[PDB]
Each structure stands twice: as C-alpha cells, then as structure tokens.
Amino acid sequence: GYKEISLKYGKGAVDVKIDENMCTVLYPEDLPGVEDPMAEVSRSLKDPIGKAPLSDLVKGKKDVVILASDITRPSPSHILIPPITDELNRAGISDDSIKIVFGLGYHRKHTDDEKKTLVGEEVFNRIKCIDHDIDDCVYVGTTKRGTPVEVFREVYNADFIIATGNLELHYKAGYSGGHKALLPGVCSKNTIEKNHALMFSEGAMPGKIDGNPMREDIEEGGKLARVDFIVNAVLNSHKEIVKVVSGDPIKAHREGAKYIDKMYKRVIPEKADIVVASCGGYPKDINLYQAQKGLDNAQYSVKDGGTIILVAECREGLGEKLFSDWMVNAAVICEVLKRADIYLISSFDRSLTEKIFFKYAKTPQDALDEAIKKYHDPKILVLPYANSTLPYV
C-alpha cells in the first residue's frame, strides 16, 4: 500500500498518503485541441452521423436558419458557422436564403459589434444576423411533460434549421448541444419557465440522457420545432475544440457525448465511502461557489453516510452573493450532499467552515485519517481534477 497522491490546492499542491489497496485515483484524459478547427468542421460535414450530408438535404431550400448562441461562453459560432455556409453555398443556397439567429433565452439583445464577434465580420456582412425576440414566438406543440413550445417566428418560418453550439457535460441537462440550441434559447418566456422547472428533478444530472427529464424535454421540444441538423463542438477543459459532430440532432449528439465520456466519464463499480476531491488548483478553487463544480461532480460517487473531503483554497471567500448569503443564514448541490459528511480543506478557519456546516481539518491528510476511522475497510476514491472528472456508477 501507501501510495502518495498530490492534490492541487490554490496556487500550489498538497500531498495525501493512502493505502494503495484501499483507494482508486481517477484522472481525466483531456485530449488536445485540433490544429485546424475549421477543417475539422468540414471533415465532419462530409461525415455526418445519422443523416445524409447537407448536399442532399438542403437542395432547393430558401430559408435556412442557423442557430448560434453565446449564453454559454466561449461560443464556437465564429469557427462553426463559416464552414457551414461554405457547404450551403456549395449546394446552391445563396446568402440571401441563409439567416443566423442568436439564442438569447432571457438575455438582452446583442450590439452590432457583439454580433460581428459571434459570427465573424465577413459572415455579418453577407448574411442577416438576428437576435431572438422572446415576445415574438409561435406555438408549435406541448411536450409530454407539459412544456408549451413557443418558437421565435424567424425560426418557425424556416424551411431548414441547423443547430450549432458546444457539446460538453452539463450539470442538469446531462450534456449541452443538440436540441438544446433551440429549447430554450429561441423560445418564449413560457417555454423557458416551464422547462427550467425540470432542473429540480432527481434525474437532471451530468452524464445522463435517458431518464433525464430536462434533457428529454429539450429533445422533445426540439423535435416539435423540427430541428433538421446539428453541428456541435466537443470541448475540453481548456474550452478548445477536440472534435466536431454533425448530422442527426439525436444520433450526432450521442456520438459527441461518447467523446466527452471518453475524456471525462470514469465509470465506478459502486459508490465509495470516502471521496477526496480537488478542484484542480487556482482559479478553479478561487471561491466556494466555484468550488461547487468539483463537489457537484463528486456527489454522485459517495455513499449514503459517506464522507467527501473537498480540497479547495477559496482565497477569495464564499463567492457569489446570493449563494454565500444562503450558506451563512444556487447552493443546491451542497444542500443535497448533506446526507454525507463534507470536509472543507480551505483557507477558512474552523469557525467559519463549521458555520456553513462543513467539517474542518487543517490538511487533507488529517481529514482522511479521521474519516477512515469512521468506516470499516472503506473504499476510497480520489479525484485530483474533480471539476472535470465525472465518476459514474
């Protein structure tokens, strides 16, 4: 036994020493970003998953709409959109038959400069770039979960809809991308409101599609809006494009989700009694609110009655105002995970750490030594990069 594992903590690192036969250490396999992203887009458009290529699908269309967004940054639009329009032009579709719609959801409209940023100045000059108008939607049906689907008129009017965006793990929708570009981004306040209520279901969790009510509602509303085709950028932890998937809004998305899974999903035979999770260093552990991203990932791998040891400096404090005010009087995950014990190894003192219901230890080793005593031959799981590593049972 007695393996030494170093865990990132703030701007440095700290060691923990574990019986090697008691523990297992899971690491992400962060792929490097492609050397030529636009060429990668072109590759995947010749290689569409679950659909014939754009060449065969858009013949004779006159109102192609491309969905882009920067609700989530960094947007891939300026890389994905030009190679798409190249394919449309190749198939005989002129720039007057092409339209780009930005999915605002609840957010404010874009300035001209911000639109040029999102699509590139050359696309902006050739092709109309239109902000979602949340007050100009058209009802197209209700999902089986009761979400009325009211789509922006520009999108409703289209004879062909190409959804673009990122594809990564999402803490509620399981994964981003696919039909998510349409629902709720270019839908009405009603669609956005009711769909968002599914966030609080028990199956709204990262890495889960089937049985995820939020993901299922999204893909359903997306299907009532008849999204035709997706182009999605698979990102790594540095938000670099490692892969592009194109084609059927369902099948292409599943392919993208397997690439994410190859990088970040670490399947686990059962839940551990002790989980040691580092956020991976400053500034991912800059404050407790941000450290939650590590804890939200570790929460699925600890047993009922288990112990999480969260290694996160939080030099800048509790973080976001509404989250912090809740902890001392958005925080949802911490509240859920309190069927286990949580040690916080941080720059906080014991009094503050305990005031927010964490257990306190000076170092991770001290926390693990006291936790190990509370269990009979505990299984120990160590997540050195918990902000991107998803243990999955």
Residue numbers in the entry: 2 to 330, 352 to 415
The authors write:
To investigate the basis for substrate specificity of this family of enzymes, we crystallized Mar2 and compared it to the structure of LarA8. Although Mar2 was produced in L. lactis cells coexpressing the NPN-biosynthetic enzymes, the resulting structure lacked the NPN cofactor and substrate. A possible interpretation is that Mar2 is in an accessible state that is ready to receive the NPN cofactor. To better compare the Mar2 active site, which is poorly defined in the structure, we used I-Tasser19 to model Mar2 using the structure of LarA. We observed that the residues interacting with the NPN cofactor in LarA (R75, K184 and H200) have corresponding residues in Mar2 (R74, K181, and H197) and GntE2 (R41, K164, H180), suggesting that the binding mode for the cofactor is the same in these structures. The first region, hereafter named “loop”, is composed of the two residues just after a catalytic histidine (His174 in LarA); these residues are bulky and hydrophobic in LarA (F175 and F176), bulky and positively charged in Mar2 (Y172 and K173), and small polar and negatively charged for GntE2 (E155 and S156), consistent with the substrates they recognize. The second region is located in α-helix 11 (α11), in particular the residue before the catalytic K298 in LarA; this residue is V297 in LarA, a Q293 in Mar2, and G286 in GntE2. The last region potentially involved in substrate binding occurs in the first loop of α-helix 14 (α14), more specifically W358 in LarA, K351 in Mar2, and N348 in GntE2 that point in the direction of the substrate side chain.
In this study, we investigated the substrate scope of several homologs of lactate racemase and discovered four new α-hydroxyacid racemases and one new α-hydroxyacid epimerase, thus uncovering a superfamily of NPN-dependent enzymes with various specificities and greatly expanding the number of known nickel enzymes, raising the number from 913 to 14. All of these reactions require the NPN cofactor, either added to the assay mix or previously bound to the protein, and lead to the inversion of a stereocenter at the C2 position of an α-hydroxyacid, suggesting the enzymes catalyze proton-coupled hydride transfer mechanisms as demonstrated for lactate racemization. The NPN cofactor, discovered in Lactobacillus plantarum LarA (hereafter referred to as just LarA), is synthesized from nicotinic acid adenine dinucleotide using the biosynthetic enzymes LarB, LarE, and LarC which catalyze carboxylation/hydrolysis, sulfur insertion, and nickel insertion reactions, respectively. Similarly, the catalytic residues (D72, H108, H174, and K298 in LarA) are also conserved in the Mar2 and GntE2 active sites, strongly confirming our hypothesis that these enzymes use the same catalytic mechanism as LarA.
